[PDB]
Amino acid sequence: SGVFEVHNNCPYTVWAAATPVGGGRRLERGQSWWFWAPPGTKMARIWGRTNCNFDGAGRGWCQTGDCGGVLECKGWGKPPNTLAEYALNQFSNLDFWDISVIDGFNIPMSFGPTKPGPGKCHGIQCTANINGECPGSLRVPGGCNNPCTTFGGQQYCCTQGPCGPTELSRWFKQRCPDAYSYPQDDPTSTFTCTSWTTDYKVMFCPYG
Template sequence: MLAPTGWSGRFWARTECSFDGAGKGSCTTGDCGTGGMECKGNGAAPPATLAEFTLAGPASAKDYYDVSLVDGYNLPMMVDARGGAGGCASTGCVADLSRRCPSELRVGDACRSACEAFGKPEFCCSGAYANPTTCRPSVYSQMFKSACPQSYSYAFDDSTSTFTCSGADYTITFCPESAPR
């Protein structure tokens, strides 16, 4: 896919999908709620591992990218930056978090976030917890972070999880070989 300058968006995988001959259906994880194969601009329903991008635009010469577990985890993912300048790093989560997922977060082979599971402001970084001073990592986000140290584990996990690069081509790999399933 060739994205235009200044584009911002997310990529994710949908799993356990079932579609009929007319393209109608749904997926167990990452479903986008359209009832069809195309998401038509809709986002992923949690739990879903996300690759997030903001490509350089008029106000910035840098691309920003990350792999996020804030909306849960449904499969391992890597983002590789190639050919760019400015310390372009690979990032992602190759660990199989479905094997480490606590029972209270487990949904089949996926792992919900604590926000999705419990809906409490302290897990969702909302209300009184909607800033980096009051929103702290939970025991659940720390579990995600220990398994995938370069991935977002909660809303304000910027310092170790946001990467920048200029002029790179990006490759997203779902289920890299190093992650047993």
């Protein structure tokens, strides 16, 4: 319960990050990072940072997902960064989790329970070649930004009230049907498992 394995299967190095628990860890291909989240942990995210350069003290910078120039993240990363989000022991004894591209996409990833269950408690992924097919307007080095990051505004960010899918969010949704494509993409993007029944695993580049 509450245990996360973050495994890197990408050809390149990935500096894993996680908040509010976890921190960060350099992961060469084949390596795993294990951390535990106390029961009740909410608004948590796990992500990978690419093309980093750190000194001996842990200060540096990353091309994507940079969390304030430090290796062990205390805060969120700079988009674009594919996200695995979770909240344990929420209402009705359920863990709520998802993969999100609301803050862009940088690395393909899978996210799922170690002990599956009925309903939505099964593994999901977002492994489409988003970086290679990314629209020119959203394209950045090593990633593909969500229109809310690139353009801003209610239409894409939904800060002013109800919003719906846009041509750009749909572009993401077509490639990753199980991931959050825009702020209010809730019905087809939320997955759950009964609390205290399973651990979780995140993999960067499942297919290599």
